[PDB]
Amino acid sequence: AAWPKAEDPALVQELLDCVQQASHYRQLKKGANETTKSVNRGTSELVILAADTQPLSIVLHIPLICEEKNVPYVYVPSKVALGRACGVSRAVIAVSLTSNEASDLNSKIRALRDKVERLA
Amino acid sequence: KPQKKETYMQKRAVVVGREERKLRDLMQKLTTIRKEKIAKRKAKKEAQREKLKKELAEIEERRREKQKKEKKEFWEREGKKRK
């Protein structure tokens, strides 16, 4: 079902790294409801979805809206490790990041979404 | 010339209604503010247009100055050659 899964070899690690960057940089919505609201406001730049979840249907409906908006998403394999990367003290299955158009973080995100677009 | 008689039309006219009267009063005051605002904005637009055409004629005068200097340069550099 979750066929655009992210592969292991440190690709997930650059993902979690940029998640840490954006979580410090406040460009971040956290939790699935925040993801849906961000993508339905269209501010989202990219969204990461856990696959380690009690049933996957949540991170199956979220790709429906990001497919409805044509903005990228990617399946991390670990909800716990994603929550730790965000710094929540709690596991998170869905984290999204928006755009702020004056940085090089945006260059990083451009690279990352190029990676996931080549994954798809 | 305005009428001093009173026509059958004017007598047979109906007295208007209250909601109608509120509506018409609103419409009146609406048209007034509309016309005066269009007057202010048209006046300001006209003053800036006149300003700008003054600077266009000024650049025309400068054009004539460079025209004078250039043509005299041409014919002074031309006269000795024919001389």
Binding site: G42, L64, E67, N70, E101, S107, R110 | -
Partner: protein, 242 residues
Amino acid sequence: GAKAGKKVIVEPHRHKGVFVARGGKEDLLCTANLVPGESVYGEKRISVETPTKTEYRIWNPFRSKLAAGILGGLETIYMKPGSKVLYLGAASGTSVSHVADIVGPTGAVYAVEFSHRSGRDLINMATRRTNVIPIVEDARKPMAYRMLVPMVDVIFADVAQPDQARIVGINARLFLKQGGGLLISIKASCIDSTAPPEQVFASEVQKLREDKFFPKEQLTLEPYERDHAMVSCVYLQKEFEG
């Protein structure tokens, strides 16, 4: 908000079929929906007691880039009511329904989508609306729906892919009438995401001219979805229809 219940007026816009409804302190855009009375996705709608069967749908720009274009005032959107339109990138069908309501019964729009469940929403709407043909396949291999798509006149495209120009180019090679037309939309961040966007647009339009297209309009849907564009070209002639 132009809240629910406000009496408004509707008039034709410039384009054949689309309508513009003005009112109060806020105007908007609508279309006469073919399928009566029913909303699709919580879109707002409009009823007029004609002197029952007369219903329009408000068209959010920010959800649908064709609507962004109709607000941006395109030159000629090529889609008359009653025209054959290959849509491309038909994700969940909202905009597609709008094009359906444009072309009406005597028109037909071929709605192609890549993924599945956005397909499910699309085909649900395809059951309902009797002029939009569901096609769920890989857009890169149009010989798959070569069985379905006849020669059409107008090509919508809104995919966000690197090979987008070649996608719509072979789809032009396969499914576009002599003197054809197309609207596509482009994101800088998905064609090449470091460069300046105008330069990216010039690269894409030069590509289409290498695909033998005649570029004939461009705009930038500027106050609505940053650094995108809508581009209008004509297939293999300088004039549009014939």
